[PDB]
Amino acid sequence: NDKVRFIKDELRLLQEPGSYVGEVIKIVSDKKVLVKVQPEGKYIVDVAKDI
């Protein structure tokens, strides 16, 4: 029964744009991390609330 609900709800996961790829460079006291994308440049985003 769970496999029925996992596959039907996968449409929302497949239509999701996904996520980028980057690396951590430096951090600040504002809880903002500097993410360096390999093809692109560097970006400052917000860290996850779990960690």
Partner: protein, 86 residues
């Protein structure tokens, strides 16, 4: 599995991360981390195996067979044995 149909993007697998989740690198140069389709398997692919991706969402679609077209050699020898070693 058949929602993707025609509009597919050629991807390439890199490294496994999570169960039914993997990182892919397409020919556009932008690497994305998506979830593996339920009909596929991590053991049925290779670290260098090329896969298919969605046009916009770039989600994993299907595992291509272990035949890379690219250029140059492509398939194999064509009319090569025209001479001997003597």
């Amino acid at each position: 599995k058949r929602i993707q149909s025609v509009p597919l993007v050629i991807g390439q697998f890199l490294e496994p991360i999570d169960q039914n989740t993997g990182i892919v690198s397409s020919t556009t140069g932008m690497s994305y981390v998506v979830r593996i389709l339920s009909t596929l398997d991590r053991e049925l692919l290779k670290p260098s195996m090329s896969v298919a991706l969605h046009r916009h969402s770039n989600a994993l679609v299907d595992i291509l067979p272990p035949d890379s077209d690219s250029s140059i050699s492509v398939m194999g020898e064509n009319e090569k044995p025209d001479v001997t070693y003597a």
